[PDB]
Amino acid sequence: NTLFQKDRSTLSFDKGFRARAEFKIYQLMKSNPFWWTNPRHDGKLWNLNAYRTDVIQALGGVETILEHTLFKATGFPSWEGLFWEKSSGFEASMQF
């Protein structure tokens, strides 16, 4: 599927990215844990989405997982149709 990328012509001029990614550890303090793979050239070299489903199936299902929590104390009828806010307005107001 890397043969069908949106930008292929510009990626055709990108050589030596493995040696360069090896030597990036002398330019940055943040160690890249995926130094070996480049997702534009190598592609999507794994896929761990199915794990999520199985771990729910491991923990007793959504009903059991949510009944460990205060889900039923919130007045929400069903778990579908919900979302989590990453930060409240107070947190983003005080960040800077």
Binding site: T2, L3, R8, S9, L11, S12, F13, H41
Partner: peptide, 25 residues
């Protein structure tokens, strides 16, 4: 266009020669 097609073909040949490396030649 033809220029973008030529560079994309160069990319595709590069990916092929990266995948075929070690077995035909």
């Amino acid at each position: 266009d033809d220029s973008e097609a030529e560079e994309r073909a160069a990319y595709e040949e590069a990916q092929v020669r990266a995948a075929m490396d070690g077995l035909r030649g």
